Amino acid sequence: SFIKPIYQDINSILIGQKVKRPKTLSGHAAGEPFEKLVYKFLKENLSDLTFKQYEYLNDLFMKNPAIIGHEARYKLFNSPTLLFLLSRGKAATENWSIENLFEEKQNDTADILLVKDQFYELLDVKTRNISKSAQAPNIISAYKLAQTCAKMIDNKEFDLFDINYLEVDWELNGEDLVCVSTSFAELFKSEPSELYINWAAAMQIQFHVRDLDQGFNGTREEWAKSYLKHFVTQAEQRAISMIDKFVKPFKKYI
Amino acid sequence: SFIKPIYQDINSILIGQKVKRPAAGEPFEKLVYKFLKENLSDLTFKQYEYLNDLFMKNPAIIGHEARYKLFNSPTLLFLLSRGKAATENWSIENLFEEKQNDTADILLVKDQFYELLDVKTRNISKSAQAPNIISAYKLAQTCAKMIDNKEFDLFDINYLEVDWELNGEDLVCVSTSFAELFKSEPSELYINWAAAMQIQFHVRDLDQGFNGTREEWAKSYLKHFVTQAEQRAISMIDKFVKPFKKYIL
Amino acid sequence: SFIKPIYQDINSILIGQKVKRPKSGTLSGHAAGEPFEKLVYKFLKENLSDLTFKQYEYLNDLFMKNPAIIGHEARYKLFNSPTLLFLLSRGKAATENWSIENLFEEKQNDTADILLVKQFYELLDVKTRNISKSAQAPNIISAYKLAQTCAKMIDNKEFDLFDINYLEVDWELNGEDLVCVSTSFAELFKSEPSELYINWAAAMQIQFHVRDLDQGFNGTREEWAKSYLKHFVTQAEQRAISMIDKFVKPFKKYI
DNA sequence: GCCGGTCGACCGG
DNA sequence: GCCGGTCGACCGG
DNA sequence: GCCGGTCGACCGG
Ligand code: NA
Ligand code: NA
Ligand code: NA
């Protein structure tokens, strides 16, 4: 992680920050420009490393004028896994140009990208409302994570990228929201066999950053293989539980 | 529908109206509610607004048990009730606020009949996938409660689509669509399991040819739900298991 | 490949070359970029006449030099390869009435367009697509024909004898004639056989764009055949199931 | 030319 | 301490 | 995405 080395500084700068409330306080809509606040800070203390996912792509393509077309542009990633996780559509990659750059995309894997010496850190910011105790938020697609681990193995890319999370806690205070806490955690540091997969909630992994464990002490290849086992096991578990919950109780009506 | 009769009045006040740019379409939902609250004052209610009034019109009714009785309907209670603790802890000093998962955005009630209005905003500047409409699971339970309690003329679930786009420093509505759930072919509703088990469709394209009974609608959907759930149990193996069974070992 | 070492020239001679619009009519089927194929042959012969035949043309030469060989048996035995037989031999009645006064002709269903051999055979098949429109992958070759080819390859063990390559010639309308703007070369036995798509409805044909065809297969030619069959069989079973769920159930309500 | 995955973040009738 | 639906609305490595 | 349907005509261990 490029952020961890200076986390204590981010936590310090965030605690106390305020943001004008939408004037609902729930939902992706009433999210938190707190992530914009994180970006602004990472852009200041790590300007040569901080990139919005769409910002990195625009940059990558800008320094390759001779390379045109999606085919030629995809090879620019020089990594099948990073291509899977960062890339944009075919027509979008084909139609890219100086007067038609990439913009924010709702389903982009990462909020902030940090690159240094061919090493990428996919950071995803999670904002939480402390005023209440809610369910763990969506972290990342368990299915997308499964494909990632599959591609890591097939390509032997166990030393290239990390997927980290930064949780920023806030509470209402008058006519604005105020940050009260923060917490950092790396995905590949937790126990892969203990990640809860909420199938209904877009097959998303879920947990509050402040609770995640960081005791995994094996290699990255083992983490991937272990995750895939847990993923396949849970997929079969869901397939069976769906019948007992969405079929059995409704057969009497047919 | 209590809105169908004035759909053109709602559309006329929406199309062309601009709002200062900063969900992003929320501003248009407030315009609908405000309109209804001024043209159907005695029928328009925010879901949480209805609950407070209901509880406020019966102060001598304390406790979750007695309060849950106030709905006089199992199906409606399932669709509108908040929570046991929330229902118990309710008070004139601790009212019900809006909740992200409330079934409806707007409630129109009259003659003991309820209309659950859910309005969907859409950025016409993009050609996206069909949005989430309503949980297929929540619909199934609802249909089950309709059968067990024989409530086929109590409520309707309708959707209003508000199309908008960014124009300069403002947002502007460009078109509107209306449709009724119980008027579409239940066996045709697409159920996106991964997407919160929600049924998805563009209000604009939603068919309205159904001419059967409300009971037949309920039974039909339930059959469609079960079958799809079974089919999904198979799809999961062929997509989330079979292709990864070569890494486990 | 024999033309591969000379692909640069071809790619350069083709691009820019133009041909009038086929009878000023439609631009599909056999009548569209057919003349281009001729242009490719006009070069592969004017620079490699030592080993460039147009399918039937070779067959005409395979004979003649064997007058004592007539009517089935001997004539069918001429091909010391059961595989090359299945991919180049004409009909029985056709390989009977052969003579100097009745030479073979170009047949619409011939496997290869141009044949280059030098013991080792290269079955070249040209492809042309209107780049002025995003279209579907064209029919490459018969999946069934390829399956029989692989089987026969294993049986008599001939994992070294012939190659199946394709040459793409992209063209676009320009005035009263069509012009080439690009070219793409690829070799069938160099891609992932388990990846090849089989369109059963489209004549059980393998479909893909020469330009996008991969060329990185790890293994011998033998491993390919083994691999393909495993793939072709699977798809066939899948097709059998798909048919019932699309051409049977959907209309079972009308009977 | 049909089909469906992803991001965001919420409590318990 | 553990389990898991619901709303919103997005295009094609 | 991935996935696949059409029009035009041809002869045969
Ligand atoms: Na995420
Ligand atoms: Na809804
Ligand atoms: Na062919």
mmCIF file of C-alpha atoms in Angstrom, chain A residues 8-98:
data_model
loop_
_atom_site.group_PDB
_atom_site.id
_atom_site.type_symbol
_atom_site.label_atom_id
_atom_site.label_comp_id
_atom_site.label_asym_id
_atom_site.label_seq_id
_atom_site.Cartn_x
_atom_site.Cartn_y
_atom_site.Cartn_z
ATOM 1 C CA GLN A 8 -2.094 8.376 10.224
ATOM 2 C CA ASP A 9 -1.873 11.663 8.291
ATOM 3 C CA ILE A 10 -5.060 11.040 6.317
ATOM 4 C CA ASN A 11 -6.942 10.048 9.458
ATOM 5 C CA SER A 12 -5.737 13.287 11.061
ATOM 6 C CA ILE A 13 -6.777 15.516 8.148
ATOM 7 C CA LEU A 14 -10.192 13.864 7.749
ATOM 8 C CA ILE A 15 -11.401 13.788 11.360
ATOM 9 C CA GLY A 16 -13.204 17.109 11.594
ATOM 10 C CA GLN A 17 -13.835 17.760 7.924
ATOM 11 C CA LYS A 18 -17.361 18.881 7.098
ATOM 12 C CA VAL A 19 -19.540 18.517 4.027
ATOM 13 C CA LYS A 20 -22.783 20.323 3.229
ATOM 14 C CA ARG A 21 -25.572 17.757 3.517
ATOM 15 C CA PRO A 22 -27.793 17.301 0.420
ATOM 16 C CA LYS A 23 -30.486 19.198 2.366
ATOM 17 C CA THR A 24 -32.091 11.991 2.060
ATOM 18 C CA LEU A 25 -29.095 10.987 4.186
ATOM 19 C CA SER A 26 -28.974 7.418 2.883
ATOM 20 C CA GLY A 27 -28.241 5.653 -0.391
ATOM 21 C CA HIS A 28 -25.549 5.877 -3.066
ATOM 22 C CA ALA A 29 -27.022 9.279 -3.901
ATOM 23 C CA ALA A 30 -26.439 10.757 -0.438
ATOM 24 C CA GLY A 31 -22.971 9.268 -0.538
ATOM 25 C CA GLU A 32 -20.108 11.489 0.458
ATOM 26 C CA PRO A 33 -17.798 13.937 -1.311
ATOM 27 C CA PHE A 34 -15.614 12.695 1.535
ATOM 28 C CA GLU A 35 -14.099 10.545 -1.194
ATOM 29 C CA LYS A 36 -13.350 13.739 -3.103
ATOM 30 C CA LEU A 37 -11.688 14.919 0.082
ATOM 31 C CA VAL A 38 -9.563 11.765 0.154
ATOM 32 C CA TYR A 39 -8.583 12.259 -3.500
ATOM 33 C CA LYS A 40 -7.641 15.885 -2.898
ATOM 34 C CA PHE A 41 -5.350 14.744 -0.071
ATOM 35 C CA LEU A 42 -3.770 11.862 -1.966
ATOM 36 C CA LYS A 43 -3.261 14.191 -4.926
ATOM 37 C CA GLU A 44 -1.345 16.574 -2.639
ATOM 38 C CA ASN A 45 0.917 14.085 -0.811
ATOM 39 C CA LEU A 46 1.232 11.666 -3.737
ATOM 40 C CA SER A 47 0.666 13.684 -6.910
ATOM 41 C CA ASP A 48 2.701 11.348 -9.101
ATOM 42 C CA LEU A 49 0.755 8.340 -7.861
ATOM 43 C CA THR A 50 -2.870 9.510 -7.481
ATOM 44 C CA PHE A 51 -5.221 8.773 -10.370
ATOM 45 C CA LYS A 52 -8.983 8.475 -10.864
ATOM 46 C CA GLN A 53 -9.561 5.240 -12.761
ATOM 47 C CA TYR A 54 -10.700 7.181 -15.838
ATOM 48 C CA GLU A 55 -7.830 9.599 -15.335
ATOM 49 C CA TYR A 56 -5.243 6.824 -15.563
ATOM 50 C CA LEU A 57 -6.780 5.477 -18.777
ATOM 51 C CA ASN A 58 -6.828 8.921 -20.411
ATOM 52 C CA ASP A 59 -3.192 9.335 -19.447
ATOM 53 C CA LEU A 60 -2.185 5.847 -20.649
ATOM 54 C CA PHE A 61 -3.712 6.571 -24.067
ATOM 55 C CA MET A 62 -2.445 10.167 -24.318
ATOM 56 C CA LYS A 63 1.188 9.016 -24.251
ATOM 57 C CA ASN A 64 0.583 6.575 -27.144
ATOM 58 C CA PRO A 65 -0.552 8.627 -30.202
ATOM 59 C CA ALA A 66 0.640 5.986 -32.674
ATOM 60 C CA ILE A 67 -1.475 3.338 -30.979
ATOM 61 C CA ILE A 68 -5.064 3.460 -32.255
ATOM 62 C CA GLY A 69 -7.950 0.996 -32.159
ATOM 63 C CA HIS A 70 -9.171 -1.125 -29.251
ATOM 64 C CA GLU A 71 -6.977 -4.092 -30.172
ATOM 65 C CA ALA A 72 -3.766 -2.080 -30.101
ATOM 66 C CA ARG A 73 -4.903 -0.090 -27.030
ATOM 67 C CA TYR A 74 -5.733 -3.094 -24.844
ATOM 68 C CA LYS A 75 -2.191 -4.475 -25.185
ATOM 69 C CA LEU A 76 -1.048 -1.209 -23.584
ATOM 70 C CA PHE A 77 -2.072 -2.608 -20.189
ATOM 71 C CA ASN A 78 0.480 -5.393 -20.523
ATOM 72 C CA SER A 79 -1.600 -7.426 -18.060
ATOM 73 C CA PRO A 80 -4.766 -9.520 -18.573
ATOM 74 C CA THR A 81 -5.882 -9.125 -14.947
ATOM 75 C CA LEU A 82 -5.354 -5.351 -14.821
ATOM 76 C CA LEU A 83 -7.070 -5.157 -18.212
ATOM 77 C CA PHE A 84 -10.053 -7.013 -16.773
ATOM 78 C CA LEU A 85 -10.245 -4.802 -13.674
ATOM 79 C CA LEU A 86 -9.428 -1.407 -15.206
ATOM 80 C CA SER A 87 -10.259 -1.439 -18.930
ATOM 81 C CA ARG A 88 -13.276 0.109 -20.590
ATOM 82 C CA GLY A 89 -15.589 -1.289 -23.241
ATOM 83 C CA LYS A 90 -14.549 -2.113 -26.799
ATOM 84 C CA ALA A 91 -16.430 0.658 -28.608
ATOM 85 C CA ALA A 92 -15.399 3.063 -25.856
ATOM 86 C CA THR A 93 -11.708 2.099 -26.169
ATOM 87 C CA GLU A 94 -12.001 2.289 -29.982
ATOM 88 C CA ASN A 95 -13.705 5.726 -29.906
ATOM 89 C CA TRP A 96 -11.320 7.294 -27.381
ATOM 90 C CA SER A 97 -9.418 10.390 -28.502
ATOM 91 C CA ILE A 98 -8.153 13.840 -27.519
#
